[PDB]
Design a protein around this nucleic acid. Structure first.
Length: 326
RNA sequence: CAGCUUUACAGAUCAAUGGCGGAGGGAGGUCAACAUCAAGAACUGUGGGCGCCUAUAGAACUUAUAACGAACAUGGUUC
């Protein structure tokens, strides 16, 4: 309609600074298909991989702190907790393990997932984590009693990212069924099922200050306030690659990594793509490989960290692009 | 052999003041329920001074070749 387009044209987005590559830390001998940082501090960030390991990394130096070898198969995801000094990690060996960070050694392997487990999210407020695998089910664990407390049946296929919010919409799943769910853990049921994607929403992330949750199928990055479970915006992601990552920055600077490796940045809520970045790879590696598989920002937000399939981790420092809608 | 404090004693006037006072058990069970027993050598309250000082106090148990055991098993997890 003309009534909306005109309005869109009238409104302007804020000039977010562009992004330039800063650090590249070829250290893993495998994909680096998870990355995470400490809520409390931003000194280190760990990165689980197809190595089977996960390595810890000092941001400032870029130096490899230490390794951790508590899986058999490849690590798919990790989550350092704000409220406790535990690092949860999870691998396609079906193990959702829990590393003490006072001793850097596993403690509570949680057992229950029938098959390769894709993501963890620690609940920001509770002493409870949430994991989901190709199982097609998101189980919540009491961390003390290392048992699945509840489980969330709804989904009809493998479930990827499964973020935890502190409100009522306490889990924000995202499947290959292309539904992204909002659940009520307490009710033992769904509350609202965002079906707006076309394909496997293989990426989703909570906004820090804004109580919303960007989510990405093969192209269209939707983003939504999950209070009602209502759409907020659609991003200009029109011919970008298969969106692997979908991290959001503190300053409303949503990042999206592709299977292409084209690092695409967007103003959040606007839905305005305001940068593209061509990937890079090593002289030995192939041009098809290069692809940002996992990524996240620091708590401040000036450094984006992208794990790419070059067996690398690339950290990114910081005139905006013209609007032009449909 | 003097002095004062307590019991055992008559019969008292019984005020005065104390102390034993709502004055009423003891010994024990291979009997329970609860609490609590590894922490700044580490305890608990009380007010007052304003999470911390200063007086009150209380305190059973376990500990310095460090422990509830002058005793010694088995698991689970990683390496």
């Amino acid at each position: 309609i003309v009534n909306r387009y005109e309005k869109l044209l009238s409104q302007r987005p804020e000039w977010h600074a562009p992004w330039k590559l800063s650090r590249v830390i070829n250290g893993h001998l495998g994909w680096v298909r998870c990355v995470a940082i400490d809520p409390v501090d931003n000194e280190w960030f760990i990165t689980g991989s197809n190595d089977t390991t996960m390595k810890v990394w000092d941001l400032a130096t870029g130096k490899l702190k230490t390794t951790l070898a508590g899986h058999v198969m490849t690590v798919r995801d990790v989550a350092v907790s704000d409220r406790h000094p535990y690092l949860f990690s999870v691998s396609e060996d079906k193990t959702v393990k829990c590393w003490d960070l006072e001793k850097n050694q596993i403690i509570r392997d949680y057992y229950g997932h029938l098959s390769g487990v894709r993501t963890v999210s620690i609940h920001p407020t509770l002493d409870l984590i949430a994991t989901a695998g190709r199982d097609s089910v998101i189980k919540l664990w009491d961390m003390r009693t290392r048992i699945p407390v509840i489980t969330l049946v709804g989904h009809k296929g493998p479930i990827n990212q499964v973020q935890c919010t502190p409100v009522d919409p306490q889990v924000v799943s995202s499947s290959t069924d292309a539904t992204v769910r909002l659940w009520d853990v307490v009710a033992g049921k769904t509350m609202k099922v965002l079906t707006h994607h076309k394909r496997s929403v293989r990426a989703t992330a909570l906004h820090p200050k804004e109580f919303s949750v960007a989510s990405a199928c093969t192209d269209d990055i939707r983003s939504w306030g999950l209070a009602e479970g209502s759409l907020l915006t659609n991003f200009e992601s029109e011919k970008t690659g298969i969106i692997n990552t979908l991290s959001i920055n503190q300053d409303d600077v949503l990042f999206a990594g592709g299977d292409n490796g084209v690092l695409s940045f967007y103003d959040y809520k606007s839905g305005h793509k305001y940068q593209s970045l061509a990937t890079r790879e090593m002289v030995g590696s192939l041009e098809g490989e290069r692809s940002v598989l996992c990524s996240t920002f620091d708590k401040t937000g000036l450094r984006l960290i992208t794990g790419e399939a070059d067996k690398s981790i690339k950290i990114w420092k910081q005139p905006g692009l013209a609007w032009n809608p449909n």
